[PDB]
Design a protein around this ligand. Structure first.
Ligand SMILES: N#CCNc1ncnc(-n2c(Nc3cccc(O)c3)nc3ccccc32)n1
Length: 837
């Protein structure tokens, strides 16, 4: 192929991994998957409306909430339209379509300052930019523009059956080899499906030298016909109480439905226990330093075939079944429970909420049972007609399920998600790719086609996939195949966008890392050295304008060198500021970004996303708790960017300026007054604080991250509180300190008008989250598994069960949470003071 040479290396520098490389494979799954994704790519590319794809209108079909109607005066909003020098203002009703305003004044209404458009058949109240304005109380400024050319979006032109085999499965362990290393060592071989271990065998313990041989057949009790698709041979290495040092995995049935055969020399992963890294079919790329195991699967090709009633039951049984279905997802199922669910299979099928539990009662090491299960899936009318529950759907995409048909019925439910909701779960859906047994899956193809069908989903998919590719040896190959698949259909315009973005951050990360080296306080020298490189970059070869990765609407321009600094933190992050590249912008506020190496911003990404989910949960119940979940992208290993929230300082530094060093109550409130221009704006600031505080109180308690040092809480000059830095004796539920309480109007032990309102919001916020207990549990589980490097135990996850008081009735839980506030009215500054040491 000709010009494809430069285009492929163009893709490689965008992805940050060579997709064509074959040095770290032992089959053709990755390449098969590239070829496999061509069709779903072509199918989506060819069927999208070229023009709607260009203006990417960001819209929603949810009701406009209670808290936003009371903002509209007399069923009429104001839209300032802009010509050249001066503007004109028009009055419009919440239902007026973009078209119904094109007459009153072919042209298109682009937002002032942003690459966002108001086009297409949706009411203007249904546009997100509008709901943003209304929320913060801001004027809607648009410009009369020419529609962007769809030509810019142009895409570059492009035999023995298994069930006839009653033989027992066997695998030969030749031995383990390690280039460099006193105990004994054995190998453990597990047949696995999900995380259920079907069969297990061990070798005898040999002395741990740099090469160990066994040459033994481990005969299993499971038969070849009884092996289900997606079953992992999991080979582990222990020494010796025993300890696990190395693990590795191999799919027994391959992507062609063929039983795995022949010689394999698999390089293995180390340890430092539920962790998504432990499930991967990928092998260690580090050939020179890693341990390896050598095996033989001896066996005509043995292909796996593709598959082509009671409802009357006793009283106490039906109730026992419903008690089982009405438990949380973390509640374990006994043998008796499982045996019950399977027998009444068909009664269970009528309840969508039974599905996780029901498919966790299947004996996957039994061909005739799985056969009955597939027949059971062929009759899923009730599931098919049910309204989409994301939390139930999530459950079926986690580590406990490895059956493609089971997982496909979940991915079926996600199809009905409007693009606004995909964005709400995209991060967690992307991470859920780690639980897929195979590189080609419904879930992967779903992400692929939702990204090709939408520039916004497409933008965030890019960085989400890129984040993991840059810092996951366990999953970089898989995500890389998917990302390439996406880029080969996103269109020339975006490819060029992505190139600028990659080039800018790769440049700025260098400057971030160089500066960190040069410090042992913001010393005289460093100040000028940073400004040295930042003026070096302004001409060669930083493109004059790039999209903000955490806010794809915003074009950033030239560095405001004067305003850039290194910060007085121990990790020396950058404080960078940019002119807005758009001359049609009506502000002059710079775009502030922090670049930081040192923290794990993947954890920050996840926690932030969950916060956005809690916000939308509250929207369903007409609540707004004014959380500030700022942009944060993980660009690499322990490195990324953060949005600078304008006009904000930490709590501790407010306590520093009055004292310097503990601790005074009124400080905050008289800091608040000295930033309010009126008195009206001051009480609005007290109001924003009442909600803000309550918001982070509820959210952090549930997540178990409420007990925090107070230079990790921030506030804006308009009262908006918010936590930061989510990287990683006697305790406290959350941070309700006596200075917070003084703002609400209380001093010691009283109930002020504002403090009641606080308790009012908290209680409602908490119980609102409890209406989504299941969903939060799964999100939280998934987060711990794909985002925390901690070999997360059951006990780490069982925290949120307690926090959300599962089982407890509505009344009893409200009093449980009010106990919590009262424990904050017991320690005051004692926990804060303890940090100081
Ligand atoms: N005006 C204004 C300030 N605006 C602002 N907005 C967001 N963050 C910060 N900020 C973060 N951010 C952060 C750092 C690591 C992780 C993470 O999640 C957030 N660290 C900080 C340390 C000292 C001071 C501010 C910090 N500031």
């Amino acid at each position: 192929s000709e010009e494809s040479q430069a285009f492929q290396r163009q893709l490689t520098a965008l992805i940050g991994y060579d997709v064509t490389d074959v040095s770290n494979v032992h089959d053709d799954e990755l390449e098969f998957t590239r070829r496999g994704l061509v069709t779903p790519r072509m199918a989506e590319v060819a069927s999208r409306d070229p023009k709607l794809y260009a203006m990417h209108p960001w819209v929603t079909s949810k009701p406009l909430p209670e808290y936003l109607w009371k903002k509209i005066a007399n069923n009429c909003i104001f839209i300032v339209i802009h010509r050249s020098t001066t503007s004109q203002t028009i009055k419009v009703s919440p239902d007026d379509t973009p078209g119904a305003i094109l007459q009153s004044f072919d042209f298109v209404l682009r937002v002032c300052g942003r690459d966002e458009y108001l086009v297409g058949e949706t009411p203007i109240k249904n546009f997100q930019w509008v709901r943003h304005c209304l929320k913060n109380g801001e004027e809607i400024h648009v410009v009369l523009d020419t529609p962007p050319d769809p030509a810019l979006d142009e895409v570059r032109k492009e035999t023995v059956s298994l069930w006839d085999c009653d033989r027992k499965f066997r695998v030969k362990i030749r031995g383990i080899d390690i280039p460099v290393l006193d105990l004994t060592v054995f190998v453990e071989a597990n047949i696995q499906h999900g995380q259920q271990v079907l069969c297990q065998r061990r070798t005898s313990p040999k002395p741990f030298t740099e090469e160990v041989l066994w040459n033994v057949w481990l005969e299993f009790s499971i038969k070849i016909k009884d092996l289900p698709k997606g079953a992992l041979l999991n080979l582990q290495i222990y020494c010796g109480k025993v300890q696990l040092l190395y693990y590795v995995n191999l799919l027994l049935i391959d992507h062609r439905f063929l039983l795995r055969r022949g010689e394999y020399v698999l390089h293995m992963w180390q340890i430092s226990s539920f962790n998504a890294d432990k499930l991967t079919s990928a092998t260690n790329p580090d050939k020179e330093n890693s341990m390896s195991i050598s095996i033989l699967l001896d066996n005509h090709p043995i292909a796996l075939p593709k598959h082509q009633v009671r409802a009357e039951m006793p009283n106490q049984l039906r109730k026992q079944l419903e008690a089982i279905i009405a438990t949380d997802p973390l509640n374990p199922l006994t043998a008796e429970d499982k045996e019950l669910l399977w027998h009444f299979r068909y009664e269970s099928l009528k309840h969508p909420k039974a599905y996780p539990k029901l498919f966790s009662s299947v004996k996957w090491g039994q061909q005739e049972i799985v056969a009955k299960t597939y027949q059971l899936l062929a009759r899923r009318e009730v599931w098919d007609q049910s309204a989409l529950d994301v939390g139930l759907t999530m459950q079926l995409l986690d580590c406990n399920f490895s059956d493609e048909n089971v997982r496909a019925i979940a991915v079926q439910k996600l199809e009905s998600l409007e693009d606004d909701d995909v964005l709400h779960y995209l991060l967690q859906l992307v991470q859920a790719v780690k639980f897929e047994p195979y590189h080609d899956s419904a879930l992967a193809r779903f992400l692929l086609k939702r990204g090709l069908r939408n520039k916004r989903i497409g933008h965030f998919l890019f960085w989400f996939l890129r984040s993991e590719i840059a810092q996951s040896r366990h999953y970089q190959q898989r995500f890389a195949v998917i990302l390439e698949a996406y880029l080969r259909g996103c269109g020339t315009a975006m490819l060029h966008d992505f190139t600028q973005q990659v080039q800018v951050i790769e440049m700025l990360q260098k400057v971030t890392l160089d500066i960190k080296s040069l410090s042992a306080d913001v010393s005289s020298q460093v100040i000028s050295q940073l400004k040295q490189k930042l003026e070096n970059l302004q001409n060669s070869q930083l493109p004059e304008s790039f999209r903000v990765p955490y806010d794809p609407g915003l074009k950033a321009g030239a560095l405001a060198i004067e305003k850039c600094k290194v910060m007085a933190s121990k990790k020396k992050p950058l404080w960078l500021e940019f002119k807005c590249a758009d001359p049609t912008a009506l502000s002059n506020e710079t775009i502030g970004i922090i670049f930081k190496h040192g923290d794990d911003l993947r954890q920050d990404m996840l926690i932030l996303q969950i916060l956005r989910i809690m916000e939308s949960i509250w929207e369903t119940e007409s609540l707004d708790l004014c959380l500030l979940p700022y942009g944060c992208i993980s660009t690499g290993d322990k490195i990324g960017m953060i949005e600078i929230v304008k006009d904000a300082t930490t709590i501790a530094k407010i306590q520093q300026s009055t004292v310097g060093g503990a601790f005074k109550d009124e400080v905050l409130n008289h800091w608040l007054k000295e930033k309010s221009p009126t008195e009206e704006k001051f009480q609005a600031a007290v109001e924003r604080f009442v909600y803000s505080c309550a918001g982070y109180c509820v959210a952090t308690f549930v997540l178990g991250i409420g007990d925090r040092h107070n230079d990790n809480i921030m506030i804006t000059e308009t009262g908006n509180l918010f936590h930061i830095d989510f990287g990683h004796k006697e305790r406290v539920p959350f941070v309700l300190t006596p200075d917070f309480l003084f703002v609400m109007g209380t001093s010691g032990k009283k109930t002020s008008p504002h403090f009641q309102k606080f308790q009012d919001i908290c209680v409602k916020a908490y119980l609102a989250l409890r209406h989504h207990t299941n969903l939060l549990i799964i999100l939280f589980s998934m987060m711990l598994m794909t985002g925390m490097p901690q070999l997360t135990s059951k006990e780490d996850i069982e925290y949120i069960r307690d926090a959300l008081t599962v089982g407890k009735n509505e009344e009893d839980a409200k009093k449980y949470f009010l106990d919590q506030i009262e424990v904050c009215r017991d320690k005051g500054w004692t926990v804060q003071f303890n940090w100081f040491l």
